[PDB]
Structures are given as C-alpha cells and as structure tokens.
mmCIF file of N, CA and C in Angstrom:
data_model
loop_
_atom_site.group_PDB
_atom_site.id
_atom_site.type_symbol
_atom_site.label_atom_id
_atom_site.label_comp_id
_atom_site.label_asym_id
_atom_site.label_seq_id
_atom_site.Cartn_x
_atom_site.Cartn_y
_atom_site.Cartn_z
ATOM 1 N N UNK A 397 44.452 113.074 77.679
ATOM 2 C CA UNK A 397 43.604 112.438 78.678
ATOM 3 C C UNK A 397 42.766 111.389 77.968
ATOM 4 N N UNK A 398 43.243 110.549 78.372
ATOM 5 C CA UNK A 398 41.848 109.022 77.717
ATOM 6 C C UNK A 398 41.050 107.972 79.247
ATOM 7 N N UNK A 399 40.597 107.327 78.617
ATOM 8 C CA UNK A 399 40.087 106.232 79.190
ATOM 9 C C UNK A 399 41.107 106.115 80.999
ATOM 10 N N UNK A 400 40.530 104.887 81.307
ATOM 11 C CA UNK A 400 41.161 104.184 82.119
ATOM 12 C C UNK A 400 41.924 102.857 81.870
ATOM 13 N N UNK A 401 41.115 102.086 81.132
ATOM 14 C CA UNK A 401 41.031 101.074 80.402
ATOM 15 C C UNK A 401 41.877 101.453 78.776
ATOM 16 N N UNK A 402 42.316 102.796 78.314
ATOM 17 C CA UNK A 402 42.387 102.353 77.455
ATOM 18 C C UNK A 402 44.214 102.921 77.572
ATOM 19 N N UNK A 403 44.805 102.948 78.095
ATOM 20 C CA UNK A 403 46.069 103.171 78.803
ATOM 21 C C UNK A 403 47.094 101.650 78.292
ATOM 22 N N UNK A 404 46.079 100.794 78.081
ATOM 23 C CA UNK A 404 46.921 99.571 77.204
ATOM 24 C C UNK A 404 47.894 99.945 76.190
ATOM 25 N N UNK A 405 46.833 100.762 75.103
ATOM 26 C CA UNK A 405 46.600 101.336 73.466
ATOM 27 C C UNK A 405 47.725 101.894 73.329
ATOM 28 N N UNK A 406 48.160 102.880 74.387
ATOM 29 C CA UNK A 406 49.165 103.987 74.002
ATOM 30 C C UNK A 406 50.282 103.102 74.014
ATOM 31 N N UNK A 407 50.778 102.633 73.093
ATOM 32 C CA UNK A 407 51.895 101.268 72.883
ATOM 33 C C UNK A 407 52.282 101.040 71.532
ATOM 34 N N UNK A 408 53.206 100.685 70.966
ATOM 35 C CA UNK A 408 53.583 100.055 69.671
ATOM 36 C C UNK A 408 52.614 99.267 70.064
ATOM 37 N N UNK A 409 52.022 99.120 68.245
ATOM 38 C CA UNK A 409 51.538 97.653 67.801
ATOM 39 C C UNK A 409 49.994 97.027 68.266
ATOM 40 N N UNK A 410 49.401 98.280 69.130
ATOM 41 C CA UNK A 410 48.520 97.995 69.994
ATOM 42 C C UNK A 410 47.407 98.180 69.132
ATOM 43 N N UNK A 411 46.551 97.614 69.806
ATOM 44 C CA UNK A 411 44.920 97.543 68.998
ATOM 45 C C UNK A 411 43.779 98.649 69.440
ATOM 46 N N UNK A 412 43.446 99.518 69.105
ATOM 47 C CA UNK A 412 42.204 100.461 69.158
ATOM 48 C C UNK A 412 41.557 101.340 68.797
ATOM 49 N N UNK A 413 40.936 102.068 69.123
ATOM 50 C CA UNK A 413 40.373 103.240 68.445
ATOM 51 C C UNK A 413 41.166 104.363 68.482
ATOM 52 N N UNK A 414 41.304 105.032 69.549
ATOM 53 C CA UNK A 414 42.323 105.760 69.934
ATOM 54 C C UNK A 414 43.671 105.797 68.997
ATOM 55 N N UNK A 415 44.215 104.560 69.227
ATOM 56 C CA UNK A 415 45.608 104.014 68.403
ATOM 57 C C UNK A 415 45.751 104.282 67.404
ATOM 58 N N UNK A 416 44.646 104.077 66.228
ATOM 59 C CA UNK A 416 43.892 104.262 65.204
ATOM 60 C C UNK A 416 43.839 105.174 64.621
ATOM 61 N N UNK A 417 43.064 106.237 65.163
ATOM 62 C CA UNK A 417 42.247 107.356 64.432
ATOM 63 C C UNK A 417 42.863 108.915 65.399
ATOM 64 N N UNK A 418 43.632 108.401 66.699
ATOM 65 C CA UNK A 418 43.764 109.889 67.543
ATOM 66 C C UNK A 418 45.155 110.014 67.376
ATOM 67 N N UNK A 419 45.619 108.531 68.327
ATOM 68 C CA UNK A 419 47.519 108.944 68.557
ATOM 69 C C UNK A 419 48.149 107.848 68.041
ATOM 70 N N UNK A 420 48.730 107.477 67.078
ATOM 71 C CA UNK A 420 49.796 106.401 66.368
ATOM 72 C C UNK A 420 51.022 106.407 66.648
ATOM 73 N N UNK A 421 51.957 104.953 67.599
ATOM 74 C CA UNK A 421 52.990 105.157 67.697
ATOM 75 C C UNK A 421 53.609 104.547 67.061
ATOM 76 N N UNK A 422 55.179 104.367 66.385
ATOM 77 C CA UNK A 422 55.696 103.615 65.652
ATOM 78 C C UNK A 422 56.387 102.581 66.125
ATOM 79 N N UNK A 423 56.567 101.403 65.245
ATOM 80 C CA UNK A 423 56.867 100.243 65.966
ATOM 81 C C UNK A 423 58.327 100.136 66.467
ATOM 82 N N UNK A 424 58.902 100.964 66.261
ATOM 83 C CA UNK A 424 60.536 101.273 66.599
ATOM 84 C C UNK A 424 60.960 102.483 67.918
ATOM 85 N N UNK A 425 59.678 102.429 68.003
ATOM 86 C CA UNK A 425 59.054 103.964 69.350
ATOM 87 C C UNK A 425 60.179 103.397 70.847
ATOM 88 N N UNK A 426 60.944 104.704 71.339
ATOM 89 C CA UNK A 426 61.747 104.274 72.554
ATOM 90 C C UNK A 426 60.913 105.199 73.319
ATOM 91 N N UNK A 427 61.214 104.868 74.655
ATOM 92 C CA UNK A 427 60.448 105.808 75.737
ATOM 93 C C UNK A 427 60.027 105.296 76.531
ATOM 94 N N UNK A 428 59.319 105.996 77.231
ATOM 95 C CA UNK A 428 58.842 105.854 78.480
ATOM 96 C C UNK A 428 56.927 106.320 78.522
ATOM 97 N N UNK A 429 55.857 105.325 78.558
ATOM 98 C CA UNK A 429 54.799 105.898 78.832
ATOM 99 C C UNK A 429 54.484 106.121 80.644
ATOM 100 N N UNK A 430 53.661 106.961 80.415
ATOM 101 C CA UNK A 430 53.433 107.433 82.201
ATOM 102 C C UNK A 430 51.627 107.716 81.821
ATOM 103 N N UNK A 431 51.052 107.164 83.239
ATOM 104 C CA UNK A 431 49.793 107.161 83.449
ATOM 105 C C UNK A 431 49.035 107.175 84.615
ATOM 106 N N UNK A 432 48.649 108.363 85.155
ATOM 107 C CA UNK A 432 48.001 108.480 86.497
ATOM 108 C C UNK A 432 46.265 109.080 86.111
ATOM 109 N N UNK A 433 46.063 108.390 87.270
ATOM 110 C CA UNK A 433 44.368 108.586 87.279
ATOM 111 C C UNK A 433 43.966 110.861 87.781
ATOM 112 N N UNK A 434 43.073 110.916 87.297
ATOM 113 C CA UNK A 434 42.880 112.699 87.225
ATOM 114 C C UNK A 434 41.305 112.566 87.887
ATOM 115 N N UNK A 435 41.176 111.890 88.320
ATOM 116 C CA UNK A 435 39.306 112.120 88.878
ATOM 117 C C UNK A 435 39.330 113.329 89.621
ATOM 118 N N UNK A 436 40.545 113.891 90.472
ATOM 119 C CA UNK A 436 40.091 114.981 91.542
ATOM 120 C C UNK A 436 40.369 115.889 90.609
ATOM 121 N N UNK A 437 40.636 115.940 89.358
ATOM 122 C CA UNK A 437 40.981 117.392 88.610
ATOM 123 C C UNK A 437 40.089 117.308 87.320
ATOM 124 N N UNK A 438 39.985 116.120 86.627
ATOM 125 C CA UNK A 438 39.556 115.829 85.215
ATOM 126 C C UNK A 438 38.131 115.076 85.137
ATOM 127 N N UNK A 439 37.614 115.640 86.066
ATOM 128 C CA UNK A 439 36.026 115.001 86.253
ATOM 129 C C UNK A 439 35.128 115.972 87.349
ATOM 130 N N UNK A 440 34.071 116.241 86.702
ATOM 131 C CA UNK A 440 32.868 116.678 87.073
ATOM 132 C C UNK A 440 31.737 115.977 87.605
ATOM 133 N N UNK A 441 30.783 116.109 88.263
ATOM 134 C CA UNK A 441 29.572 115.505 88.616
ATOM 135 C C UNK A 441 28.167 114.897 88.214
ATOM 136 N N UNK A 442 28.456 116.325 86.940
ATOM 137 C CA UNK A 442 27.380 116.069 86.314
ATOM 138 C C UNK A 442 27.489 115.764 84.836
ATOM 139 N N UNK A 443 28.844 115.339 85.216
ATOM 140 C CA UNK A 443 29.364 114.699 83.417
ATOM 141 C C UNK A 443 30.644 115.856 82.712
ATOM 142 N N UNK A 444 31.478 115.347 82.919
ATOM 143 C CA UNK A 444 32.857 115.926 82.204
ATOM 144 C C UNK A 444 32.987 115.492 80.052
ATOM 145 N N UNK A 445 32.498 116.837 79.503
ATOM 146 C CA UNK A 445 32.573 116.223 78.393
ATOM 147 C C UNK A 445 33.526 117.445 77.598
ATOM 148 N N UNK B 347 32.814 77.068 89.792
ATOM 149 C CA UNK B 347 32.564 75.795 89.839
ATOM 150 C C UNK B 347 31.576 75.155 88.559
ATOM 151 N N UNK B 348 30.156 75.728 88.286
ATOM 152 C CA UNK B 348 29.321 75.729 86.900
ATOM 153 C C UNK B 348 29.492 76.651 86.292
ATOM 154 N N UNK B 349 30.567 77.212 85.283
ATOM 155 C CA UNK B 349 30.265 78.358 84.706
ATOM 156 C C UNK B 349 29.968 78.183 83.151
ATOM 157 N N UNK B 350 29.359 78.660 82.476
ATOM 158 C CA UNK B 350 28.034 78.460 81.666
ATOM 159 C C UNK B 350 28.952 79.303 80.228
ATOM 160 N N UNK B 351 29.162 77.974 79.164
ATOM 161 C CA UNK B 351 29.506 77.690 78.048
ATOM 162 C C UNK B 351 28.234 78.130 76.559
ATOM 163 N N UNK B 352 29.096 79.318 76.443
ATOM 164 C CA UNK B 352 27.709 79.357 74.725
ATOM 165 C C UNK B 352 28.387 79.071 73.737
ATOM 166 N N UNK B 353 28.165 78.432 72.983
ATOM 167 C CA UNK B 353 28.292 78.092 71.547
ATOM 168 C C UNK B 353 27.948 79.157 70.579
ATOM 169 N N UNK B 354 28.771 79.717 70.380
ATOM 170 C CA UNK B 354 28.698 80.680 68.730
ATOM 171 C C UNK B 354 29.214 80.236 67.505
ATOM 172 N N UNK B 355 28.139 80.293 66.576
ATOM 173 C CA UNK B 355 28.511 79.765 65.036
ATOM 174 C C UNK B 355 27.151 80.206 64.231
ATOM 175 N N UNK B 356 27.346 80.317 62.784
ATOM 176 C CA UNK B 356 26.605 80.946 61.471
ATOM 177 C C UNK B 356 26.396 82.611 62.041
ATOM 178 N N UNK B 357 27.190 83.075 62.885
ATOM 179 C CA UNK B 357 27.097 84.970 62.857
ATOM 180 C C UNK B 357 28.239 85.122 62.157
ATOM 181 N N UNK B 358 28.154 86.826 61.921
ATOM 182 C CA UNK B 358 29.067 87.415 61.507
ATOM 183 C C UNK B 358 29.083 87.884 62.468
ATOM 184 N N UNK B 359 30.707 88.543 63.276
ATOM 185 C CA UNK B 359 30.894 88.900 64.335
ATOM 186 C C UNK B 359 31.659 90.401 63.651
ATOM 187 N N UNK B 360 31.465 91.592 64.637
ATOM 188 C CA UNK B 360 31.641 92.716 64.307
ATOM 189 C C UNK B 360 32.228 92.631 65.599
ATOM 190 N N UNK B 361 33.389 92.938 66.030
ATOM 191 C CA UNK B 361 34.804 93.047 67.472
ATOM 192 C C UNK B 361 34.105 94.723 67.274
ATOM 193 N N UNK B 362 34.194 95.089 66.594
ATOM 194 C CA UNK B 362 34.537 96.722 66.259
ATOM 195 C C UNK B 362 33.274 97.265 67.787
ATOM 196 N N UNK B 363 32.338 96.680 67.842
ATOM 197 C CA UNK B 363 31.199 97.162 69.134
ATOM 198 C C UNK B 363 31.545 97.071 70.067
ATOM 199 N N UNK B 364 32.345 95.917 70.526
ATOM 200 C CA UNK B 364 32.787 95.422 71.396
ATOM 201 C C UNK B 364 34.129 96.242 72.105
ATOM 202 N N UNK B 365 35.256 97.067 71.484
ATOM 203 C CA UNK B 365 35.307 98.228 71.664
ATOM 204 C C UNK B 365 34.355 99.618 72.025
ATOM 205 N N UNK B 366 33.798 99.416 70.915
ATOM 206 C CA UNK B 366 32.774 101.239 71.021
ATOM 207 C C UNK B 366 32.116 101.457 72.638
ATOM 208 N N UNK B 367 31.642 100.602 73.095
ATOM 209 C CA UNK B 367 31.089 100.550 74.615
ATOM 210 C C UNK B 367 31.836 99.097 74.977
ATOM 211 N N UNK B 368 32.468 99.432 76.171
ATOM 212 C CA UNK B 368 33.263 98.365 77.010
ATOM 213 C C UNK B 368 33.857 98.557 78.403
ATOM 214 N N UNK B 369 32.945 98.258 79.473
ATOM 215 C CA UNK B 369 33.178 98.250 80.849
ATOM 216 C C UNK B 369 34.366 97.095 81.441
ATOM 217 N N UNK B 370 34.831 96.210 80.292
ATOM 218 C CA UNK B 370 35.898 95.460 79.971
ATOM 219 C C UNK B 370 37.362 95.853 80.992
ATOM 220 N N UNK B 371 37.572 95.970 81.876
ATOM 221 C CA UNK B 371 38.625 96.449 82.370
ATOM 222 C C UNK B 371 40.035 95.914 82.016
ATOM 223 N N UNK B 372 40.060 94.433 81.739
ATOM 224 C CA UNK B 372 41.038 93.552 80.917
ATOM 225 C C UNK B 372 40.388 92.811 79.886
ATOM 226 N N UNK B 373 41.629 92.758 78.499
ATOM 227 C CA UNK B 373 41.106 92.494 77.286
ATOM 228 C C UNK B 373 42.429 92.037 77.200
ATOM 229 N N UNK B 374 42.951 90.658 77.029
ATOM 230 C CA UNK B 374 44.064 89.979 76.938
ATOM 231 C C UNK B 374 44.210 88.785 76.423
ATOM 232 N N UNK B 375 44.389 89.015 75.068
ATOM 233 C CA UNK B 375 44.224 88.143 74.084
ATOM 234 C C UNK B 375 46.017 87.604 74.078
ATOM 235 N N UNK B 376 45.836 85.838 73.638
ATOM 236 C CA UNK B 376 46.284 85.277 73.745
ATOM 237 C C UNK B 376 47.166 84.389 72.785
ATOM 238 N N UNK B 377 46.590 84.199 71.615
ATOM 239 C CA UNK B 377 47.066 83.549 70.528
ATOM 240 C C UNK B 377 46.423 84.532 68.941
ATOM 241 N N UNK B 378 46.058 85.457 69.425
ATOM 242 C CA UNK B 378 45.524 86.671 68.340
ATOM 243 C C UNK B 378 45.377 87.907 68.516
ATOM 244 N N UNK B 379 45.733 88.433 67.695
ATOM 245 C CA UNK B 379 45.443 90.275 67.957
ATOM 246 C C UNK B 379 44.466 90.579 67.850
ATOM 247 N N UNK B 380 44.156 91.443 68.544
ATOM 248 C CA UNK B 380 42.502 92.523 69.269
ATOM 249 C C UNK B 380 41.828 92.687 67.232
ATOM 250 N N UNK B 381 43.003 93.539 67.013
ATOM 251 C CA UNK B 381 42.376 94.271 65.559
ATOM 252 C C UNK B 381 41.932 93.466 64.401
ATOM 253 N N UNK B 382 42.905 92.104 64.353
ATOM 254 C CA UNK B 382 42.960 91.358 63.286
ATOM 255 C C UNK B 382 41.442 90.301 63.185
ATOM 256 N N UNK B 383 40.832 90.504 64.438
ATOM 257 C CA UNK B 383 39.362 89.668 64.630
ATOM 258 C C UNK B 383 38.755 89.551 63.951
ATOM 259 N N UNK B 384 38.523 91.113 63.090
ATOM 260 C CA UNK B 384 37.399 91.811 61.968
ATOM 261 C C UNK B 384 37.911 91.460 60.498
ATOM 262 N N UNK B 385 38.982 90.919 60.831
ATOM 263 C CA UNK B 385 39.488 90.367 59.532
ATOM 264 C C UNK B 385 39.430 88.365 59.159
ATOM 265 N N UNK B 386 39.362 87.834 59.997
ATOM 266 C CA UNK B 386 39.779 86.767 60.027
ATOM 267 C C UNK B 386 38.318 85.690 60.305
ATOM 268 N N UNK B 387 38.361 84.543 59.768
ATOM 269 C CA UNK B 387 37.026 83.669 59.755
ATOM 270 C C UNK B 387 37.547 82.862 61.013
ATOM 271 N N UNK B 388 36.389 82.283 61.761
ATOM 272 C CA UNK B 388 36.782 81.348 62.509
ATOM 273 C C UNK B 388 35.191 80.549 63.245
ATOM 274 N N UNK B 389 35.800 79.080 64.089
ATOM 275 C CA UNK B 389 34.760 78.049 64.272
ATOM 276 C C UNK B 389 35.357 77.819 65.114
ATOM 277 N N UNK B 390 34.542 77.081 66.196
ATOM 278 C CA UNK B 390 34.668 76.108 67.851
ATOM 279 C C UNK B 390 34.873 78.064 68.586
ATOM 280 N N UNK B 391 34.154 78.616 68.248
ATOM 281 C CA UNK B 391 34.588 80.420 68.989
ATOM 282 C C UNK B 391 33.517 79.217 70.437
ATOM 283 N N UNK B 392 34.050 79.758 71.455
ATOM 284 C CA UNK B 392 32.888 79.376 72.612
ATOM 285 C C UNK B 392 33.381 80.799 73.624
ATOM 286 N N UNK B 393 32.076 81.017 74.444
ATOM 287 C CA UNK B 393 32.086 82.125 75.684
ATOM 288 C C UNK B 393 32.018 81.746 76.588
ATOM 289 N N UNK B 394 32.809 81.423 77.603
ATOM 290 C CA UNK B 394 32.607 81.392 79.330
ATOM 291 C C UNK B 394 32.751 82.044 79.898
ATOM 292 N N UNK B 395 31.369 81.914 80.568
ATOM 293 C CA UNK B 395 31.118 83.134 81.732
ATOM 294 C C UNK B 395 31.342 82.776 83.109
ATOM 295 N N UNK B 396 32.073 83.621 83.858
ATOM 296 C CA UNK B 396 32.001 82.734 85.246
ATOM 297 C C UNK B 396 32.365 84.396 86.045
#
C-alpha cells in the first residue's frame, strides 16, 4: 500500500523514495503493475498510520 | 493569461524536500530525470505559476 501519487515509482528506472529505499525494480522487469484506490478499507478518520 | 515568472539563481537546490512533502499530484519531467537533479548544476532554472 503506498501513496496515491506515488503509483508512478513502482516502474523500471523510476525516481523516488519508495523506489529507492522500500521496493526496487529491475530494468529488464516484465509484467504487469495494477493499482486501485483502498479509502473504504485502508483509511481511518482519525489518521491511518 | 498573467502567470507570474521567478527567477532562481546563487541557491543550492535540494529536489530531495520537494519529494519528502508533496501535494504534487503530477511530476513530469521532460528533458531530465526526477533523481539526477541533486546531482547536476544548472542556470536560466525559472518557476511559473499559473
């Protein structure tokens, strides 16, 4: 689960923090990324941490 | 129609913040990579805001 905004990152070659320091893909990477929004499951009211 | 031109020059620019907090929804760089910023010198940088 990341960002909204940061759904770019998860990519060969891509630029970020995430990319960086959490999940690294390789530049020869085949596949398929998939990305749906979780607000009715992955968020709280008074702050999901 | 006026959208308002700043001139940046004599900073050191740190990209790396500009990540850390970013309500940025698109970041779509064009003739340079996001990462390579923090590495690289540069002049005529300008910001338009509109």
């Amino acid at each position: 689960v990341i960002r909204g905004n940061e759904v770019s990152q998860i990519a060969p070659g891509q630029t970020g923090n995430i990319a960086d320091y959490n999940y690294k893909l390789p530049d020869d990477f085949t596949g398929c990324v998939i990305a749906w929004n979780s607000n009715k499951l992955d968020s709280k009211p008074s702050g999901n941490y | 129609y006026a959208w308002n031109r700043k001139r940046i020059s004599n900073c050191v620019a740190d990209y790396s913040v500009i990540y850390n907090f970013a309500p940025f929804f698109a970041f779509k760089c064009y003739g340079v990579s996001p990462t390579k910023l923090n590495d690289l010198c540069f002049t005529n940088v300008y910001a338009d805001s509109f």
